[PDB]
């Protein structure tokens, strides 16, 4: 039932309700002659919504806001980008124009600026050291250490036992490393073990791209990273 990359036309966004007040958003982008899905999260915060990650570009993110308006009907008041790449910050300008307060760690904000990407406005304190966690409305934000990127955060929704890994967690059908240009391959398994140690109770683990699963996705990701290391 989870929407697959083959069912979403680029420019369109789907929502998938995981638990009471918890949804993933799924969009697609064309990249190098292939089409890739991408996930983010939506978490109900009283009578408002917290958005985790853009929908990978301005057009998709505008479509995301329209689909939230239509299907949920509560305002997106805050958004967090989990690292500085375009599948997470691309669309921040759209969100800001719509009155969404955008947030990222100071590490992510700096890297986005260096990369010429869109820059979330507000800085999230308390995430500078591996293993740091902070509460942000209805979620917990966790910096596990460098992995897919040096700034990558993961997000836990305690009420639903939902762990969103962003691009630091791969889906099971991904057997080779994705974009690792900005990755710390040497630290990535250690960072994943920090995630496992902090959220052993997680029931629903969402990768940055593709199908959700259980905590098996963490060991899967380590396997793929280590195999790539030994390439
Ligand atoms: C575009 C930029 O956002 C990328 C990034 O975030 O590194 C996107 N995400 C990933 C990932 O591996 O998680 C990609 C893998 C396929 C690309 C070859 S494309
Ligand atoms: Zn990335
Ligand atoms: Zn503000
Ligand atoms: Zn990605």
Phi, psi of 224 (to 5 degrees): -70, -40
What are the tokens at 204? Answer: 């629903």
What are the tokens at 191? Answer: 């960072």
Ligand 2 center to 110 CA (angstroms): 15
DSSP-based helix, strand, coil % in the chain, nearest 5: 25, 30, 45
Residue 36: nearest ligand to its CA? Answer: 1
Does an H or E element contain 138, and which? Answer: none
Q: What kind of experiment solved this structure?
A: X-ray
Phi, psi of 171 (to 5 degrees): -75, 160
Residue 50 near residue 137 (C-beta atoms within 8 A): yes
Kindly tell me the sign of the dihedral angle through the C-alpha atoms of 131, 100, 85, 171: positive
The secondary structure of 169-219, three-state, reads CCCCCCCCCCCCCCCCCCCHHHHHHHHHHHCCCCCEEEECCCCCECCHHHH
Kindly tell me the sign of the dihedral angle through the C-alpha atoms of 115, 120, 125, 130: negative
74 contacts: CB under 8 Å, gap ≥ 6: 44, 47, 48, 49, 68
Ligand 3 center to 115 CA (angstroms): 23
- CA-atom Rg of the chain in angstroms: 16
| Closest C-alpha to 108, from 122, 91, 96, 93 | 122
- Tell me the pairing of strands 204-207 and 162-166: parallel
Residue 114 near residue 124 (C-beta atoms within 8 A): no
Separation CA 146–CA 131 (nearest Å):
11
**Domain range enclosing 211:** 1-231
Residue 25 annotated as binding site: no
What are the tokens at 10? Answer: 């680029």
Please compute, for residue 161, the number of CA atoms within 13 A of its CA located in the half-sphere on the CB side. 8
Separation CA 139–CA 158 (nearest Å):
7
Residue 124 near residue 95 (C-beta atoms within 8 A): no
Catalytic residues: 83, 85, 87, 148, 179
Ligand 2 center to 47 CA (angstroms): 31
Residue 198 annotated as binding site: no
Separation CA 54–CA 72 (nearest Å):
17
What are the tokens at 61? Answer: 């993110």
Residue 113 near residue 131 (C-beta atoms within 8 A): no
Residue 100: nearest ligand to its CA? Answer: 3
B/e letters for 187-226, b = 16+ CB within 10 Å, e = fewer, are: bbbebbebbeebbeebebbbbbbbbbbebebbebbbebbe
Integer CA distances (angstroms), 210 to 4, 30, 104, 129, 170, in order: 7, 15, 23, 28, 8
Count: domains in the chain: 1
Separation CA 175–CA 217 (nearest Å):
12
Separation CA 103–CA 52 (nearest Å):
10
What are the tokens at 81? Answer: 């980008």
What are the tokens at 23? Answer: 């949804």
Ligand 1 lining (C-beta closer than 6 Å): 31, 36, 85-87, 148, 167, 178-179, 208-209
What are the tokens at 146? Answer: 């460098």
Q: Please name the residue whose Cα sits nearest to atom 10 of ligand 1.
A: 179
Q: What resolution in angstroms does the PDB record give?
A: 1.5
């Amino acid at each position: 039932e989870y929407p697959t990359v083959s069912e979403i036309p680029v420019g369109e966004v789907r929502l998938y309700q995981i638990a009471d007040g918890v949804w993933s958003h799924i969009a697609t982008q064309s990249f190098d002659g292939a089409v890739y899905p991408s996930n983010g999260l939506i978490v109900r915060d009283g009578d408002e919504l917290l958005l985790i990650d853009t929908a990978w570009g301005a057009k998709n993110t505008a479509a995301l806001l329209a689909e939230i308006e239509k299907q949920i009907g509560l305002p997106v008041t805050r958004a967090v980008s989990t690292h500085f790449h375009d599948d997470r910050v691309g669309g921040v300008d759209v969100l800001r124009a719509a009155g969404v307060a955008t947030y990222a760690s100071p590490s992510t904000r700096r890297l986005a600026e260096v990369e010429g990407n869109e820059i979330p406005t507000h800085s999230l304190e308390g995430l500078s050291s591996s293993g740091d966690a902070v509460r942000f409305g209805p979620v917990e934000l966790f910096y596990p250490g460098a992995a897919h990127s040096t700034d990558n955060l993961v997000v836990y929704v305690p009420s639903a036992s939902v762990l969103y890994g962003g691009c630091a967690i791969y889906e099971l059908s991904r057997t080779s490393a994705g974009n690792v240009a900005d990755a710390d391959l040497a630290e990535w398994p250690t960072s994943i073990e920090r995630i496992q140690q902090h959220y052993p109770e997680a029931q629903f683990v969402i990768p940055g791209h593709g199908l959700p699963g259980g905590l098996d996705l963490l060991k899967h990701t380590t396997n793929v990273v280590k195999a790539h290391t030994n390439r």
